[PDB]
Every structure is written in structure tokens, then in C-alpha cells.
Design a protein around this ligand. Structure first.
Ligand code: HEM
Ligand code: HEM
Ligand SMILES: Cc1cc(N)nc(CCc2cc(F)cc(C#CCN(C)C)c2)c1
Ligand SMILES: Cc1cc(N)nc(CCc2cc(F)cc(C#CCN(C)C)c2)c1
Ligand SMILES: C[C@H](O)[C@H](O)[C@H]1CNc2nc(N)[nH]c(=O)c2N1
Ligand SMILES: C[C@H](O)[C@H](O)[C@H]1CNc2nc(N)[nH]c(=O)c2N1
Ligand SMILES: [Zn+2]
Lengths: 412, 416
């Protein structure tokens, strides 16, 4: 009940007590571990269930500010109880909303970048009423977060769900992503991961420039209405041309990527309240672009072309030509972002940062929920310290959760 | 109940029903996932007739189902015979056929093993008539010679007598049959394999004269029938080794690296129908990354990334040059090059993971499932350019099984 985790590279042993405060469920049982299931039913999302959730959240909020069991605490519990009995929901104080957003990041067990959790810039967009207003808020976020390459973490929080018919949703999975179109010859142009979304953009009325790296438009749904298209001003989208510090032919590949990773399709849960539109952003770890975006077989899948340009022996997999090109591709991404002075972290620094964060969380908080399947980078896993680090995965709230894609849900 | 797993690279979806036949625990609960804990208590291993009949019956039902004789008179007589042997003697003996079946299926059920496509072609050596440490040495030598096969490696397992009262255990004190010594220097540096320092000290204390080199093959330390272990040197002509060179880098040979060809795990416990075989060394062939990534490049192992990157003239001042990643690829190229050039069986992580995906799909269709530990199956480099990274996996415990056990020097009662 008081669990130990060991680091097998350093023999460091940490004692976790924080999991005992876990609310939500893992999907595992004592008979089967689902540790590698991408999105079990749990990680996706009445008057009765709402007040215990509010009480739990307010109790931890007032404990964090050392006013647990204080006048202010009891009065707020009273007031929220009062408001819930009446309105069947409630509204967060600005201070509680900031707390809940920072702690939803702090509790994101799949996030390696959480050492930064406390410096999040929270943009309260709860007064937004239309898609045009959502657009305005999202442009201001992008510009704030981008900061001429000196990226700053940010979240923008639109009005909470009420009855589920009045949902605010960003239909894009990230604020900035490249279009994907199926080809007449059978292949795919651009990002294959976004073929379905790119079709719905045209189906909703986009005029695609059918290129390879076309920044998708935003598809914004306010108050449960039909969603609307808006183009992000190009001057707000910081992109990096990808070149290599050795291979001069690298630039001829035509590669670029955007500076700002901005997840926009998740659900933020605070004190039982649900924020279905809550785009957040930080900065990339290099492997997200170079390993996953560029070399996944279901993505831009450039390995075969880069390997040819390197004149590697691609006859037999045992020459490790894939691995050799993978490393060079990732050297170039880091090289390019650093050259253009756009914030980026390599997987060695980020994972070392996370070990220090874990140490801090165990020491000051009693634990740190962590999903090893996601924390370990997708290349060079065992030469990063997280590979040898035992982690306990459990679900704390406030949290970011997954939600169904809107087009499946939207009553039109 | 059905359970579906998806491959996120190919959208293939599979349905698991085999998890219903799962007996042991995982360590996880609805409220915590222990999926990255190295040795949960549930994976580690004094057992009465009470709980033993149902373990034997479950195993024998499985066995006779596989041979299409479920409910036959042979099946019922065997159940009756095992029943009476337990109540009369408090344990029972496996037939040869049952032992072979159990050992193959313990491999088949090993959810952390990526090499399981080969599970049906295991050579089982019955050493249950062994009585002394000298006998164990002889059986192990024959295992090494057979499995090595001049570089054309063959999977094999040698099964020594099962536990009785836990006071007469057969144990191989080595974690692997062939491993290099590690020596802690007075200045704090380590000569040889840092992973084997403690075991090397035991061997030295037990009378081993250590050559004190960087690649000294450790002696076997063998315990029969609960007696104190005895030292034996594997005959060097039986230990196939591969000098490591690089196909393009001529200076790589001058690093002085070599490795042995035969990976042979010797500290695990084989569980079959509730019988516990505490000495069951088994061997296959290497996946390249086991040597080139873990053995050579772990900070806690030979840790040669620094020297290799130095010799490659890489930018080592900023980690974001990915000089560690670059040197790691070159080393793994060299391991695979060296083994193939010497015609010693090896498999690269691309081939092995691709084969495992095929094995896994086949197991879903013909068996209803394939328990798999993603944390262990995904290779320690280049994870997502292998197909297992994108593959959802269900981890559960089936028997027969291989289990961890405590290191014998922590539990042994010394006679002297
Ligand atoms: C500041 C630098 C940041 C870095 C380097 C970083 C890094 C990462 C990485 C590599 C992943 C793995 C996901 C993937 O591979 O697609 C991840 C997941 C995640 N990140 Fe962070 N992130 C950062 C900022 C943030 C912020 C600001 C938030 C929220 C406010 C956040 C919340 C999350 C969540 C919720 C997930 C996983 C979603 C899930 O449960 O599957 N991250 N992050
Ligand atoms: C034939 C070629 C084989 C290959 C390529 C292979 C590969 C591997 C690898 C790479 C691992 C994880 C290695 C690590 O510790 O980093 C593993 C684990 C394992 N292997 Fe296989 N293996 C093979 C044969 C066998 C055989 C013949 C057996 C038993 C009869 C076996 C049983 C196991 C078990 C039980 C584990 C899990 C150990 C644990 O739970 O920690 N393997 N294998
Ligand atoms: C803020 C941020 C920073 C960063 N450096 N990187 C990301 C993108 C990684 C990410 C985060 C997340 F919250 C969800 C998903 C997803 C998905 C779809 N699928 C893989 C499950 C990806 C986001
Ligand atoms: C037969 C075989 C083939 C192969 N290719 N490779 C191995 C070694 C991998 C292995 C197997 C095992 F059963 C246990 C351990 C261990 C350990 C100690 N600790 C890290 C958990 C390692 C064995
Ligand atoms: C903490 C973690 O469970 C531990 O480092 C595991 C990770 N995955 C592994 N996978 C393999 N094949 N071998 C290992 O030793 C490990 N170590
Ligand atoms: C099936 C498996 O869970 C899936 O491929 C996961 C593995 N680990 C991951 N880890 C990260 N960081 N991001 C991912 O998208 C995934 N995908
Ligand atoms: Zn689990």
C-alpha cells in the first residue's frame, strides 16, 4: 500500500504514497495489464455525482494554500454546495481554474515535460460565446505561446460543458497541423494522419491548396453550434525549414515543421466540471517530429528516401540503415530548430529533466504518476535514464482526458 | 468476455479470449498499473498437497487437450495415477511427454520474450536423474555443446530435479551459463562486466582463481540436492566467442571487444502443473541489441559509448548532437556484422519484432491470444521504427511459466 519504485541504473529507490489518493481507474486488473492500450474506455470521457467531485477538488485546493479547515475553506465549500443544489453545476474562481489547469498537467502520467507544470500561462476564455471569438482567443494563444520562437507554455479554457448539447469544441487535434490528401495514383500527399480531417474541412468548405505542408484551417464549434472555418494568420505560424549540419542534400528533401505543438482535442476535468475545448501548448521534444512525424510508416515515412540519399545498404535490415537514417533525421530537426532559435528539447535532456522532476515529486508530493510506455522516447530508449526507471501509473484528478471526435458526436 | 487489441500502424484488430484461462496475478489493480515494475512479487517464486491437485489437474487437462485426448481413458487414468501419487507421496512425477510439453509452453507463455515464434522447436534435455554438482556440470556442458552447434545455434533447455521440501533444491548460481567476470577496483572503477561483480566475488571466495581480465568467462557454481555449490570451469573449447569489428571502421577491432555467442539463462524457475524446477537453464540465440545496446552501452555495463564516440570524432559537448545515438547505432552494426561474418546465429531487432508480430497474430487465430509485455518486447533502440511499438498488447500470466526466484546466496543454508 506504500509502494517502492527502483531505478535499475542508479539503485535509487523512491516510496510512493500518492497513488492512495487516486480517484479514476487504470483499465488493468489483477488478471490482465492493459498498460499498452492506447486509449482504454477510462482515458476517454447529474446533480448527485457533482458535489463529491467539487468537495475533493476544493479540499486539495485549500490544502495547497495551507487553508484546509479554515473559514475561507468551509465558506467556499458551502457556497459551491449552495450553487450546485441550485444551478445543478457551478463556476470556478479564477484562482481555482488556474490551480486545476496546472494540476491537470502535473497529473498527466504520459507527459515527459511536466517539470515545467507550474509555469503554465492560463488564458480564461470562459466568456467566449462564438466561433469567431474562439478564433480570436486561439490566435492570441498562438502568438503568446510562440513568442518569436521563445516558446511559453499556455492553455486557453473555453466555457465548460453544461448539458452536452452546448459543447465548445476545437475539431482540430492540434491547432497547427499539415493537411493530408489521398492521391489519384493511390498514395498520400501531406500528412496521412489528417486525411479524414482534411476531407471534413473541404466538406465544410475549405479551399485546399493541395500541397504537402499546408497548414490546416481551424474548425471551431461554439455552444454546440455547427463548426466554422478560420485560417490562422500565416505570420502567427512559426515554421522551421529542416536542414542538416552535414548533408547539404538534406534541404532538397523539402522538409519543414511547425514550432508550436498545441493539443486541442482533449477534455480538461476539474472538480467534476468538464472543459471540452481547452487547447494547450508547450514546445517539442525533437523525437516527436523526427521519429514519429517523419518516420512512422503511417505518417510522412521519409526513411526510405533519406536512406537512399545517404547511399546506405538497404538490401538487408541487419545493416541498420533505418536506424542510421533515423539518427541523422533527428540530428537535423534539433539542428534546424536550434539554428532558427525555436525552443526544442532533445530526448536526452527531457528525460533527464523528468527524472529530476520525479525525484522532486516523490520528495515534495509523495509520488508522480507515470506511464512508462509513453515516457520512454521512441528511439534510443535504453540510453535515456527513464528506461531503467520503474514507474507507477495511476489516475489523479484534475486531468486531461480523451473524448470522441466531434464529427461522430455532433448532431448537425 | 472478448478483449480487442489494435495495431495503430496497420489498423489490424485482434480479439483475445485466452486471457480468460489466466490464473496468476499481474500486480496491477483497477487503481494502479505496475506494468513497468521489473520484478513484481507475482513474477517471483514449500507447497502442500492442498493446492497441488488442482494445479496438476489443470495442467493435465491442458496437456491431454493439446494431444486431442481430453476425457479419454488415458486422460482419466493419468489423473487418477497423479492423484494417488500426490496423496501418497505429497508430490508427483511428470512423464517425459508432459515435461517436454510443459517446457515448450512455459516459453510459449513468456510474455516478455520476443523470440517466441520458435517456441515449438525447443530441445528438452531431461536431467531429472541428476544427483550431484558434477552431474549437473556434465549435463550443462552437453547443453552448451548441443546448443552452440559450431555457431548454428539451437534452442535447448536442461531440466534438473524438481523441488521437494525446498531444502534440497537444485540451483545454478550463475544468472547465465556464460558470462564475463566483473572486478571492483580499489579506485572505484570496474574491470569487466559491472553486472557480475557480486557473483564474481562469490566465485573468488569459493576458490576461483580469477584471471582479472576484461572478458574472463565465469566458472559455473552448481548446487545439487540442497548441498553447498561447487565450482567448475566450462571447457574453453565449448565457449564460442565473437571478436567485435566494424564493417567500415577499422579502429573498432582495436577497442578489444568480444562477446559470447550463446545466451543461456540459468537462474529462473520453471513451473509445470505446480511442480517447481528451480534449475532449468535454457538457451536460444541473441538479438543484436541485447549485446550492442544493453551489454555494451548501459551506463551500468561496459559503457563504451564514450570511447566509440571519441574514436568517431563526434561532437560530444552538447547531447543534442545525438552523439550517443550515433555511436549506439555503429556499435549495433558492428555486433551484427561480427556475428554474421563468423556465421554465429544472431537476429537484428527489425527481423525479430517483425517475426514476433507474425507469431502474435498466429497465436490470436489458433490460440485465442498471445500474452505480451510491451515494456520488454519493444527493443531498447529505434523503438517506433519496429512494428511492435505500434502494437497494443495484453499482458497476463499463463501456466506453465518461467518465474523469477531469489538469488541463492541470499537464501542458502550453508553446510560448510
Ligand atoms: C513544455 C514542454 C512539453 C513537452 C516537452 C511535452 C512532451 C510530451 C510528450 C513527448 C508527450 C508524448 C505524447 C506523444 O508522443 O504524442 C506528451 C504527452 C502529453 N502532454 Fe506533454 N509536453 C509539454 C507540455 C505540455 C503541456 C503544457 C501540457 C498541458 C497543459 C501537456 C500535457 C500532456 C498530455 C495530457 C499528454 C498525454 C495525453 C495522453 O494522456 O495520452 N504537455 N507530452
Ligand atoms: C530463440 C531465440 C530467442 C530470442 C531471440 C529471445 C529474445 C529475448 C529477449 C530479447 C528477451 C528480453 C531480453 C532482456 O532481458 O533484455 C527475452 C526474454 C525472455 N525469454 Fe526469450 N529469446 C529466445 C529464446 C528463448 C528461449 C529458448 C526461452 C525459454 C525456453 C526464452 C524465454 C524467455 C523468458 C522467460 C524471458 C523473460 C524473462 C523475464 O521475465 O524477465 N527465450 N527473450
Ligand atoms: C503540449 C504538447 C507538447 C509537446 N511537446 N507535444 C505535444 C503533442 C503530444 C501529444 C499530447 C497529447 F496530449 C495527446 C497526443 C495525442 C494523440 C493521438 N494519439 C497519439 C493517441 C499527443 C503536446
Ligand atoms: C534464451 C535467451 C535468448 C536471448 N536472446 N536472450 C536471453 C537473455 C534475456 C533474458 C532472459 C531471461 F529469462 C531473464 C533475463 C534477465 C534478467 C535480469 N534482469 C534484467 C531482469 C534476461 C535469453
Ligand atoms: C523499469 C523497466 O521495467 C526496466 O528498465 C525494463 C524495461 N524494459 C526492458 N526490456 C528488456 N527486454 N529488458 C530489460 O531489462 C528491460 N528493463
Ligand atoms: C500500442 C502503443 O501503446 C502505442 O504505439 C503507443 C506506444 N507509446 C507511445 N508513446 C508516445 N509518447 N506516444 C505514442 O503515440 C505512443 N504510442
Ligand atoms: Zn497494468
Amino acid at each position: 500500500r506504500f509502494l517502492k519504485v527502483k531505478n535499475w541504473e542508479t539503485d535509487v529507490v523512491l516510496t510512493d504514497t500518492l497513488h492512495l489518493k487516486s480517484t479514476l481507474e487504470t483499465g488493468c486488473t489483477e488478471h490482465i495489464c492493459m498498460g499498452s492500450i492506447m486509449l482504454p474506455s477510462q482515458h476517454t470521457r447529474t446533480k448527485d455525482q457533482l458535489f463529491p467531485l467539487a468537495k475533493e477538488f476544493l479540499d486539495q485546493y485549500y490544502s495547497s494554500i495551507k487553508r484546509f479547515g479554515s473559514k475561507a475553506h468551509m465558506d467556499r465549500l458551502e457556497e459551491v454546495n449552495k450553487e450546485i443544489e441550485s444551478t445543478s453545476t457551478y463556476q470556478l474562481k479564477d484562482t481555482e481554474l488556474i490551480y486545476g489547469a496546472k494540476h491537470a498537467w502535473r497529473n498527466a502520467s504520459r507527459c515527459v515535460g511536466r517539470i515545467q507544470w507550474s509555469k503554465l500561462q492560463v488564458f480564461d476564455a470562459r466568456d467566449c460565446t462564438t466561433a469567431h471569438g474562439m478564433f480570436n482567443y486561439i490566435c492570441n494563444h498562438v502568438k503568446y505561446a510562440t513568442n518569436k520562437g521563445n516558446l511559453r507554455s499556455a492553455i486557453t479554457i473555453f466555457p465548460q460543458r453544461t448539458d452536452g448539447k452546448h459543447d465548445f469544441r476545437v475539431w482540430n487535434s492540434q491547432l497547427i497541423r499539415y493537411a493530408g490528401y489521398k492521391q489519384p495514383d493511390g498514395s498520400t500527399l501531406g500528412d496521412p494522419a489528417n486525411v479524414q480531417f482534411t476531407e471534413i474541412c473541404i466538406q465544410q468548405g475549405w479551399k485546399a491548396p493541395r500541397g504537402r505542408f499546408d497548414v490546416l484551417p481551424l474548425l471551431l464549434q461554439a455552444n454546440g453550434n455547427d463548426p466554422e472555418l478560420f485560417q490562422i494568420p500565416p505570420e502567427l505560424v512559426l515554421e522551421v525549414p529542416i536542414r542538416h549540419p552535414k548533408f547539404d542534400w538534406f534541404k532538397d528533401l523539402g522538409l519543414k515543421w511547425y514550432g508550436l505543438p498545441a493539443v486541442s482535442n482533449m477534455l480538461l476535468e476539474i472538480g467534476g466540471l468538464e472543459f471540452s475545448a481547452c487547447p494547450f501548448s508547450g514546445w517539442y521534444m525533437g523525437t516527436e517530429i523526427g521519429v514519429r512525424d517523419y518516420c512512422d510508416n503511417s505518417r510522412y515515412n521519409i526513411l526510405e528516401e533519406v536512406a537512399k540519399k545517404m547511399d546506405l545498404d538497404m538490401r538487408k535490415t541487419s545493416s541498420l540503415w533505418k536506424d542510421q537514417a533515423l539518427v541523422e533525421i533527428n540530428i537535423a530537426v534539433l539542428y534546424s530548430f536550434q539554428s532558427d532559435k525555436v525552443t526544442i528539447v532533445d530526448h536526452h535532456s527531457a528525460t533527464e529533466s523528468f527524472i529530476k522532476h520525479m525525484e522532486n515529486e516523490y520528495r515534495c508530493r509523495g509520488g508522480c504518476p507515470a506511464d512508462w510506455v509513453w515516457i520512454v522516447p521512441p528511439m534510443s530508449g535504453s540510453i535515456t535514464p527513464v528506461f531503467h526507471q520503474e514507474m507507477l501509473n495511476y489516475r489523479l484528478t484534475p486531468s486531461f482526458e480523451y473524448q470522441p471526435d466531434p464529427w461522430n458526436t455532433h448532431v448537425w
